[PDB]
Amino acid sequence: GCNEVNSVNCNTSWKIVLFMKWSDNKDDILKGGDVVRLFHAEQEKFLTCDE
Amino acid sequence: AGNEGSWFYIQPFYKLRSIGDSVVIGDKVVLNPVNAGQPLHASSHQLVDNP
Numbered sequence: 502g503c504n505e506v507n508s509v510n511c512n513t514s515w516k517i518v519l520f521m522k523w524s525d526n527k528d529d530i531l532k533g534g535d536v537v538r539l540f541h542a543e544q545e546k547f548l549t550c551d552e
Numbered sequence: 553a554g555n556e557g558s559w560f561y562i563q564p565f566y567k568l569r570s571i572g573d574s575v576v577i578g579d580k581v582v583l584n585p586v587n588a589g590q591p592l593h594a595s596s597h598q599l600v601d602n603p
Contacts, residue, residue, distance in 0.1 A: 543567040545567070
């Protein structure tokens with residue numbers, strides 16, 4: 502299933518909720534909605550998984 | 553005496569935590585002589601008056 506939405510006559514509900522703020526968005530922070538690379542690891546290493 | 557050798561080694565290392573910041577409590581690389589002066593003993597070397 503892979504429809505979409507535009508133009509033609511049809512009523513529809515929408516919208517979202519709690520995602521990002523004026524507070525968090527700038528900057529670095531922990532960009533929770535858009536976190537990047539997995540690693541704890543400081544053993545000269547930044548481990549992250551692979552198959 | 554507060555003389556030449558004390559003076560400390562410029563004082564961080566490990567990995568966590570680069571020079572140019574505040575360390576409060578942790579564990580650290582301590583003094584060098586200006587005369588070089590680090591690294592340092594851990595030793596297994598003592599005499600009879602004490603264990």
